């Protein structure tokens, strides 16, 4: 998994929130993936996605990162009676909402960007969809 480099608390509520995010559209790159689904990324998924993306666009592209896991959440091992104490941080989730931008490519063809994002998400569970900045 992937985790913060600085913290202030070491456990966090699972958190239930409604849809929509402020970052709805790209504001740097000319391409992106926004979200259609919602859920939580374990953070091995974010790791796999980054990997797959890079291998395609090569060093031609230009990268911007959004979505940061920062909610830890604990997991109690098997053979432990639930609701007696609380487990150890074995999650590092990023609560995601519809329209949440993932990554952002630029400096590449539209086709190349699509088939780096196609490789990325497919190791991210939610359905995604292509973004073209246009001029806005």
């Amino acid at each position: 998994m992937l985790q913060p480099k600085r913290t202030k608390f070491r456990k966090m509520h699972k958190g239930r929130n409604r849809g929509l995010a402020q970052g709805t559209d790209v504001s740097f790159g000319s391409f992106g993936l926004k979200a259609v689904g919602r859920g939580r990324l374990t953070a091995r998924q974010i790791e796999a996605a980054r990997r797959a993306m890079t291998r395609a666009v090569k060093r031609q592209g230009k990268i911007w990162i959004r979505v940061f896991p920062d909610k830890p959440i604990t997991e109690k091992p098997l053979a432990v009676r639930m609701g007696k104490g609380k487990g150890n941080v074995e999650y590092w989730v990023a609560l995601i909402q519809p329209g949440k931008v993932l990554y952002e490519m630029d400096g590449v063809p539209e086709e190349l960007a699509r088939e780096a994002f196609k490789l990325a998400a497919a190791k991210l569970p939610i359905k995604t969809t292509f973004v073209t900045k246009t001029v806005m």
């Binding site: 926004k34 979200a35 259609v36 329209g99 969809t129 246009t134 001029v135 806005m136």
Partner: protein, 94 residues
């Protein structure tokens, strides 16, 4: 440049707004200067394909409302947050 067909909208509130969009008619306003704002409803399908092109956001549009013409520019554009579908577009006069 797109020369686009719209008409006055006298139907307001979220309920009516939602209802409107299903009939391919999405709310919108023209405003500019100290002239009165014109609450119109453009046609979804038409504007959808037009706004896909960058021409829309960067050239004088001419929205024919009630046999008159108003020269505007498309300023802000409030899209659906995971579909290329629209929900509203703010127009600031040119």
């Amino acid at each position: 440049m797109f020369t686009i067909n719209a008409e006055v909208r006298k139907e307001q509130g979220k309920g009516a707004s939602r209802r409107l969009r299903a009939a391919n008619k999405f709310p919108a306003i023209i405003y500019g200067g100290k002239e009165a704002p014109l609450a119109i409803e453009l046609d979804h399908d038409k504007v959808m394909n037009m706004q896909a092109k960058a021409e829309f956001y960067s050239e004088v549009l001419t929205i024919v409302v009630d046999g008159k013409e108003i020269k505007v520019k498309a300023q802000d554009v409030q899209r659906h947050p995971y579909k290329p579908k629209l929900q509203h577009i703010d127009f600031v006069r040119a």
